[PDB]
Design a protein around this ligand. Structure first.
Ligand SMILES: Nc1ncnc2c1ncn2[C@@H]1O[C@H](COP(=O)(O)O)[C@@H](O)[C@H]1O
Lengths: 73, 348
C-alpha cells in the first residue's frame, strides 16, 4: 500500500506502508527518506491530526491516500 | 481620479510604525491567556508568544495593504476597470492619509486575541481588538487628531472595521484591505496550496485586476522569504483532491469522466467531505480543477509550476531556517521586521 505525504513547499513523499503501521512508524519512514525529525512532523488526514500511538487503519487511511505533513515548531 | 502620492510608505512613515510598536508592546508580545495553542515557543534563544497572529503576521498584512493599493493605482493608470463600491470609488482611489489610517487599524486587528481559538471567541477577540485601538488613539489623541484621524467620527469608522459586527468584508476600501490583508497571510500554511491560491486570487482580482493580483502574490512570496516564514509550492499537476475553500468541500468526477453539475454548463455541485459517493465516482483532483477552462479563464494557474521553500535547500534544511533566531527577531522587533519587509519590497 502506497500513501502520499504532501508538504506546503510542494514536496510529495511516496511511502510504502501497510494499515498496521503506526503513525510513529510513518514518521520514522519520513525521516528515513527526507531527514525530517519526527519531533517536527505533524501529519494531517481528512482535516484530522494523526496521533502517534494509533495506526493508519484507525483513521481509515487507505491506498493512494494523501496526507499533509505540517511542520511542527 | 487617482490621487497624487506624497512619498507615503509603510517603511518610512513613523505614525504607522509607532502604532505597530504600541500593539506589540501592549498586546502582540504578551503571552496568550487562553488555552488554545497559548503555550509559547523558543526560537534560537528567544520566546515567541504568538507565532500565528503576532507581530510579523500583523506587519505583513500592512505590507499587503500597501502593495495592493500600489498595484491598484498602476492598474487604473493603465486604463483598467476596477470593481466599485457603493459610492463609486475603487481601491485605486485610496489616498495616502486613508491608507495610513487603514494600516493603523490593521496593527490592532488581532491584538484582541487571547489564543488561537477559532470562531468561538470571534466577537470577544474583535471587540477586544477594537478596545485596544480606541485606547491607543485616546492616549495619543494630541498627535492623531485631527492630523491623522479627522475627528472622533473618523475614529469610530476604523473602530467599526476592526470590530467587524456584520462581517461586511467588502463594504469599503478599508474593509477589503483589512480583511483580505488578514486572509491572504494564510498562504503560509494552507494546503493544498493550489486550491487556496486560486481561491484567494478570485477574492482579490475583481478589485485590482489580474496583473495587479499576480504582482501581489509574487511579492508576498518575497515577504514570506524575508520574514523567515514558509514559502508554498505551486504544482499545476498536483494529483491530490481539490479542496473547495468556501465550505471546505469537494467536487466529484462521475462514472463517466465528467464533473457532477447541478441542472444547467451548470455550476459544479458542492460536495460535503463527509458524504459518501456512489461507487465509480471520485473526488476532483487539483490538476483537473486547474485545467477546467472556467478556472483557466479567471486564473493563470494551469501549466504553472513554482518551487516552494528555498531552492538548493533540502526540506529539512529549510526547517532550520524557519526555526531560526531570525524568525524570532521578526516576531519581537518592529524595526527589524519592517527592515526585512522593506528590502523585500524594493527587490520587486
Ligand atoms: N472571502 C473573504 N473576503 C474577505 N475577507 C475574508 C474572506 N475570507 C476570510 N476573510 C477574513 O479572514 C478572517 C478569517 O481569518 P482566520 O481567523 O485566520 O480564519 C475573516 O474573519 C475575514 O476577516
Amino acid at each position: 500500500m502506497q500513501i502520499f505525504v504532501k508538504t506546503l513547499t510542494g514536496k510529495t513523499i511516496t511511502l510504502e506502508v501497510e494499515p498496521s503501521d503506526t503513525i510513529e512508524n510513518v514518521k520514522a519512514k519520513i525521516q528515513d527518506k527526507e531527514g525530517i525529525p519526527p519531533d517536527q512532523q505533524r501529519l494531517i488526514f481528512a482535516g484530522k491530526q494523526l496521533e502517534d500511538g494509533r495506526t493508519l487503519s484507525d483513521y481509515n487511511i487507505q491506498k493512494e491516500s494523501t496526507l499533509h505533513l505540517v511542520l511542527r515548531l | 481620479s487617482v490621487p497624487t502620492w506624497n512619498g507615503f510608505s509603510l517603511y518610512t512613515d513613523e505614525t504607522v510604525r509607532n502604532a505597530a510598536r504600541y500593539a506589540y508592546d501592549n498586546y502582540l508580545g504578551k503571552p496568550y491567556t487562553g488555552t488554545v495553542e497559548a503555550t509559547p515557543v523558543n526560537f534560537g534563544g528567544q520566546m515567541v508568544y504568538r507565532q500565528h497572529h503576532g507581530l510579523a503576521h500583523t506587519l505583513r498584512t500592512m505590507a499587503y495593504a500597501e502593495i495592493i493599493v500600489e498595484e491598484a493605482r498602476k492598474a487604473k493608470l493603465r486604463g483598467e476597470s476596477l470593481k466599485t463600491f457603493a459610492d463609486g470609488r475603487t481601491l485605486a482611489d485610496v489616498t495616502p492619509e486613508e491608507l495610513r489610517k487603514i494600516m493603523i487599524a490593521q496593527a490592532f486587528f488581532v491584538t484582541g486575541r487571547d489564543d488561537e481559538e477559532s470562531s468561538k471567541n470571534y466577537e470577544k477577540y474583535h471587540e477586544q481588538s477594537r478596545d485596544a485601538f480606541l485606547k491607543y488613539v485616546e492616549e495619543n489623541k494630541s498627535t492623531l487628531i485631527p492630523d491623522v484621524f479627522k475627528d472622533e467620527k473618523d475614529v469610530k469608522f476604523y473602530a467599526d472595521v476592526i470590530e467587524d459586527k456584520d462581517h461586511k468584508w467588502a463594504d469599503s476600501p478599508a474593509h477589503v484591505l483589512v480583511n483580505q490583508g488578514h486572509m491572504v497571510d494564510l498562504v503560509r500554511v494552507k494546503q493544498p496550496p493550489e486550491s487556496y491560491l486560486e481561491y484567494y486570487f478570485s477574492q482579490l482580482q475583481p478589485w485590482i485586476g489580474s496583473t495587479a493580483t499576480e504582482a501581489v502574490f509574487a511579492t508576498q512570496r518575497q515577504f514570506f522569504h524575508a520574514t523567515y516564514e514558509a514559502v508554498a509550492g505551486f504544482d499545476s499537476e498536483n494529483k491530490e483532491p481539490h479542496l473547495v475553500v468556501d465550505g471546505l468541500g469537494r467536487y466529484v468526477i462521475g462514472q463517466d469522466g465528467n464533473p457532477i453539475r447541478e441542472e444547467s454548463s451548470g455550476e459544479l455541485k458542492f460536495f460535503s467531505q463527509k458524504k459518501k459517493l456512489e461507487e465509480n465516482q471520485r473526488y476532483m483532483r487539483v490538476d483537473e480543477y486547474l485545467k477546467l477552462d472556467e478556472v483557466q479563464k479567471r486564473f493563470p494557474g494551469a501549466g504553472k509550476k513554482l518551487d516552494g521553500g528555498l531552492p538548493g535547500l533540502k526540506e529539512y534544511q529549510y526547517l532550520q531556517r524557519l526555526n531560526s533566531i531570525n524568525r524570532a527577531r521578526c516576531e519581537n522587533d518592529v524595526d527589524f521586521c519592517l527592515g526585512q519587509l522593506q528590502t523585500a519590497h524594493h527587490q520587486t
